[PDB]
Design a protein around this nucleic acid. Structure first.
Ligand SMILES: [Mg+2]
Ligand SMILES: [Mg+2]
Ligand SMILES: [Mg+2]
Ligand SMILES: [Mg+2]
Ligand SMILES: [Mg+2]
Ligand SMILES: [Mg+2]
Ligand SMILES: [Mg+2]
Ligand SMILES: [Mg+2]
Ligand SMILES: [Mg+2]
Ligand SMILES: [Mg+2]
Ligand SMILES: [Mg+2]
Ligand SMILES: [Mg+2]
Ligand SMILES: [Mg+2]
Ligand SMILES: [Mg+2]
Ligand SMILES: [Mg+2]
Ligand SMILES: [Mg+2]
Ligand SMILES: [Mg+2]
Ligand SMILES: [Mg+2]
Lengths: 53, 62, 106, 252, 220, 104
RNA sequence: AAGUAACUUAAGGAUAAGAAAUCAACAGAGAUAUUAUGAGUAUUGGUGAGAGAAAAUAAUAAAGGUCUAAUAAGUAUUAU
RNA sequence: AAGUAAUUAAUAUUAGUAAAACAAUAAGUUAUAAAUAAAUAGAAUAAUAUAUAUAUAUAAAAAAAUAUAUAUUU
RNA sequence: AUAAUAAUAAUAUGGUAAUAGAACAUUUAAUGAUAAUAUAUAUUAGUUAUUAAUUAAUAUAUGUAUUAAUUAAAUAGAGAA
């Protein structure tokens, strides 16, 4: 997980790390959450407006 | 803070979720009356629900 | 004794997101003194008796359904599961029966 | 035959990564118990804790002058009858424009509310768990525990900056710069930060002081539910986190 | 965003307080729930003021007296002890008696034991413990149940200080380097009670010195 | 030994300083002028022939004695025989029961 | 209501109190002073209105004990 | 320009904990047993009251009143 | 076995004293994007079953809401002294 984080550039949260039991699961998570935001910066999650569409 | 009505405390004692009291009319002038009839007034009596609230307010720590 | 144990002794199944505890399963933790958390409660000025069941982890609906299956004699209607605190209220003083049902597993 | 088929045993340990400070680098995992760091998020308990804390915090300095406090004479301004005007007493009445306030408060106004200790502990746990879920709970340590990856050369295991007090070349100092660099790295310049130390980290607070409006460095003992929840990312020492867990554990 | 701007109380916790004297459609309009024009409307009569009739704290005669010499024991039923034993909370080494201090330690009795403990018999049927008990006193039925179980009761005298010392001997040691000595029964009634074999009083059961001294005095 | 002595409570230490154990103080009441005059007893003044009150008033004396008992330094204090106070186990043992207890 | 308001007099940075002719109860404690529990309990009242302790356990608190008196008489006590 | 505050008591609703709660320094308050003016009395001898506990009464019952009992204490 | 919305059938919906339930305006505290193409206040005309808010135009201010929302509270609403 540390290696994955280092290569990625991004931080996978502690809870997520605890949950995900396989490399495949980790990959799937990454594809879901970080990837789309990385692709499109307007699509990214903002803190002050968490319920944005 | 609130305090107990001492006269009321003297008159009334606790009995679970009610108060018990002595009967009125058995301190003098008893002669002439029937003794059996008088025996009704010798014991104690539970508080009537009409004045239960009043009693509670008088005796906050009971 | 130690609050956080070492990394070696902790197994994988002990961690969160393992063994599938969320999906349609539950637990009912005993009290500090070591008794089943099932209590009589006398609401509305002693007029409304109800049996409360506390300390439920996981799916409460499933647990309720299981209890109903165990105790068919209690009606279906009288099983109010409050979701905010996760506790399941029953109408009668049905404490002892509930305890009996739970004891075997919890 | 099978009485409670869907009964099962819950998970009991969540892994939190133990990091080196200046650069948040994974050194080890540490399994903290699920009750501290992964409780179900009960909002009502959290609310109770917050409101109580707010009530405790109150100064309560409202001190408007009542008709006694207000400083007019006690004299009757116009005689009761034979004036051709409404009846008046002294000039202090709430009814009149210069008079004192009706039902006036008098400072200090005690706004202190109570909470059960257990409830408060539960709330404290709950807030921490919520923070962990968010991905806003950075556990820094490695001194006591057995490591996997070794600590970096320029980082350190405690939550502090080195040679902060030293300032020889220019008025600018190194610990501040390091802090700024750290902020730049993890993209939390304007965000609220909450550094839960164990012992007094003087250099850290000095480094912070530039960003005092957003960064709050607190001890292990004086940290609050409010402080934890307000924070955009908490930075807790492993030892401090252990202590908190011990404090707010349900007793057996 | 932080949770701090989205916290509510639990449903059913809070209420809106009834706010008076604030417009007609509010409900609590001009009169503000007071009614109309009386003493209660603008002033204060007492809640229990009965009008002038002889009140319910005057009609009736005053009854009884407060026995200041009374010292109410906390009651412990055999049933509770049995339950504790079943639960495996009744931790006793062989020979060690279940004394009032011991009960407190275990959590059999809980809250402040000011004057003592009486052992009552509410689960005398299912009581089967051969352990030895010791309290301020016991019910006759309770005693009989204990005897049947193969147990052994002893009613033991304790002045309030002596009781306190018994409950928490370490405190006294900490303060003064010495636990205080247990007093003799000075009172006549107390002496009489513990001199009874039927009560299983300690003065007869242990064959005390005080009782012997009294007997000698009587003789002489 | 010196360190242990120093570790003794304050009042006891003060007493030892101002009435030291080298002097064998009297068991009985004495002249106030005497060197061996017991501070716990009421000593008579030789000229006036009036009993002076004890140098250590009764409470203070009792406290001192209890301190000595605690640290096992009783015999170095001067004797409390003719002061009517007994203490603890000795008091318990030596006392006669009241007339009311023995003969109701 | 209240030994309150008020008037009068006198002192000090504070004053007052303070090292038991004290409490307690046959076991014991050990200056003062303030607060919490004890407790609106005991106690008391045209037994109405109402008034209401102490012991004990906690804090706060300072080194907290220490002679300065030839050990105290119109004093204790009694009556009123 | 007008139902406010403080110290208390009783109800209710929810939430925490639960045969315990609050508090953890001990101490205390409430609960855990019902009575009785008060006293050294106090809940199935073999089961629902027809048993038991207390107060009146008594040799002990009966009698009035309230309370206690039909894997798990409330 | 819930919630929201919408159907159908039925019953109910005058109200002083009073009781109960649910909202809104205002001000402060906690959390908090955004921005002169914006925000606030005012006027006029529209809109939403409408004490309220919103749209447009016009005016004046301000490089800007302790803003929306949830909580906590109130010197929280005036034709009646
Ligand atoms: Mg007749
Ligand atoms: Mg509040
Ligand atoms: Mg109306
Ligand atoms: Mg009117
Ligand atoms: Mg009227
Ligand atoms: Mg009349
Ligand atoms: Mg007076
Ligand atoms: Mg005066
Ligand atoms: Mg002075
Ligand atoms: Mg007091
Ligand atoms: Mg003298
Ligand atoms: Mg003298
Ligand atoms: Mg006189
Ligand atoms: Mg009799
Ligand atoms: Mg209507
Ligand atoms: Mg106003
Ligand atoms: Mg106006
Ligand atoms: Mg109008």
């Amino acid at each position: 997980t540390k290696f994955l984080q280092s290569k990625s550039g991004y931080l996978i949260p502690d809870y997520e790390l605890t949950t995900l039991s396989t490399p495949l699961q980790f990959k799937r998570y990454i594809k879901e959450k970080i990837l789309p935001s990385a692709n499109d910066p307007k699509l990214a999650y903002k803190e002050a407006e968490p319920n944005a569409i | 803070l609130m305090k107990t009505h001492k006269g009321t405390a003297k008159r009334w004692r606790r009995t679970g979720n009610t108060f018990k009291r002595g009967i009125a009319g058995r301190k003098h002038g008893n002669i002439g009356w029937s003794h059996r009839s008088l025996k009704a007034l010798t014991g104690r009596k539970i508080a009537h629900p009409a004045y239960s609230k009043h009693l509670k307010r008088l005796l906050p720590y009971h | 004794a130690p609050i956080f144990p070492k990394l070696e002794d902790v197994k994988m199944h002990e961690l969160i997101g393992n063994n599938n505890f969320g999906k349609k399963t539950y637990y009912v933790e005993r009290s500090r003194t070591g008794n089943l958390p099932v209590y009589s409660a006398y609401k509305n000025g002693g007029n409304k008796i109800i049996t409360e069941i506390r300390k439920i982890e996981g799916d409460v609906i499933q647990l309720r359904n299981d209890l109903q299956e165990q105790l068919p004699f209690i009606p279906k209607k009288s099983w109010s599961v409050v979701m905010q605190s996760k506790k399941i209220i029953i109408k009668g003083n049905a404490v002892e029966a509930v305890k009996r049902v739970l004891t075997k597993k919890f | 035959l099978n009485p409670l088929p869907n009964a099962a045993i819950p998970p009991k340990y969540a892994l939190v990564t133990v990091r080196s400070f200046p650069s948040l680098e994974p050194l080890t995992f540490v399994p903290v118990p699920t009750s501290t760091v992964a409780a179900p998020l009960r909002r009502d308990i959290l609310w109770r804790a917050v409101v109580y804390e707010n009530d405790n915090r109150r100064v309560g300095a409202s001190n408007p002058p009542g008709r006694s406090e207000n400083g007019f004479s006690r004299r009757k301004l116009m005689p009761q009858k034979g004036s051709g005007r409404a009846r008046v007493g002294d000039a202090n009445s709430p009814t009149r424009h210069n008079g004192g306030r009706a039902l006036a408060r008098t400072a200090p106004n005690d706004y202190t509310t109570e909470l059960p200790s257990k409830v408060y502990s539960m709330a404290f746990n709950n807030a921490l768990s919520h923070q962990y879920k968010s991905g806003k709970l950075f556990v820094i340590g490695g001194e006591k525990v057995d490591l996997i990856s070794p600590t970096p050369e320029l980082d350190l295991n405690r939550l502090d900056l080195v040679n902060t007090n030293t300032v020889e070349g220019k008025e600018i100092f190194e610990g501040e710069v390091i802090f700024r660099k750290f902020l730049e790295e993890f993209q939390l310049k304007g965000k609220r930060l909450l550094f839960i130390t164990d012992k007094t980290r003087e250099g850290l607070i000095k480094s912070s002081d530039p960003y005092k409006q957003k960064v709050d460095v607190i001890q292990k003992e004086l940290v609050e539910v409010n402080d934890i929840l307000r924070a955009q990312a908490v930075f807790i020492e492993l030892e401090a986190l252990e202590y908190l867990a011990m404090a707010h554990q349900k007793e057996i | 965003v932080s949770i701090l701007g989205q916290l509510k109380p639990s449903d059913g916790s809070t209420k809106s307080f009834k706010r008076l004297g604030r417009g007609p459609s509010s409900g609590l309009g001009k009169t503000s729930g007071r009614g109309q024009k009386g003493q209660k409307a603008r002033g204060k009569v007492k809640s229990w003021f009965e009008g002038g009739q002889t009140p319910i704290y005057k009609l009736f005669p005053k009854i009884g007296f407060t026995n200041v010499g009374a010292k109410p024991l906390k009651e412990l039923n055999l049933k509770r002890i049995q339950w504790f034993h079943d639960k495996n909370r009744l931790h006793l080494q062989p020979g060690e008696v279940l004394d009032m201090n011991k009960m407190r330690k275990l959590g059999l009795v809980t809250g402040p034991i000011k004057y003592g403990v009486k052992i009552l018999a509410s689960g005398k049927f299912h009581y089967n413990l051969p352990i030895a008990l010791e309290a301020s006193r016991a019910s006759a039925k309770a005693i009989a149940a204990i005897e049947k179980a193969g147990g052994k009761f002893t009613a033991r005298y304790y002045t309030p200080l002596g009781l306190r010392a018994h409950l928490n001997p370490q405190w006294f040691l900490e303060k003064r380097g010495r636990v205080p000595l247990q007093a003799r029964p000075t009172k006549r009634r107390d002496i009489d009670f513990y001199s009874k074999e039927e009560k299983r009083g300690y003065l007869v059961m242990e064959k005390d010195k005080l009782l012997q001294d009294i007997k000698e005095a009587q003789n002489k | 030994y010196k360190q242990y002595f120093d570790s003794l409570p304050l009042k006891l230490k003060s007493f030892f300083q101002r009435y030291p154990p080298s002097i064998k103080y009297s068991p009985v009441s004495t002249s106030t002028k005497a060197i061996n005059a017991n501070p716990f007893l009421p000593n008579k003044h030789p000229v006036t022939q009036r009993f002076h009150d004890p140098k250590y008033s009764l409470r203070r004396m009792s406290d001192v004695y209890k301190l000595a008992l605690r640290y096992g330094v009783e015999e170095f204090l001067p004797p409390i025989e003719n002061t009517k106070k007994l203490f603890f186990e000795e008091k318990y043992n030596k006392k006669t029961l009241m007339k009311g207890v023995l003969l109701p």
